[PDB]
Amino acid sequence: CSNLSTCVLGKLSQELHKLQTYPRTDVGAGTP
């Protein structure tokens, strides 16, 4: 985040990354 451009782009990129696959939330260790 620099001013607004990098901030919004960074936010959207992070949101996309957080999902990635999204098997109803990226828990992984559901029933380990």
UniProtKB/Swiss-Prot annotation:
GO molecular function: hormone activity
Keyword Secreted: yes
Domain of life: Eukaryota
Protein family membership: Belongs to the calcitonin family.
Species the sequence originates in: Anguilla japonica (Japanese eel)
Name the record gives this protein: Calcitonin
InterPro entries named among the record's database cross-references: Calcitonin (IPR021118), Calcitonin/adrenomedullin (IPR021116), Calcitonin_CS (IPR018360), Calcitonin_peptide-like (IPR001693)
Record localization: Secreted
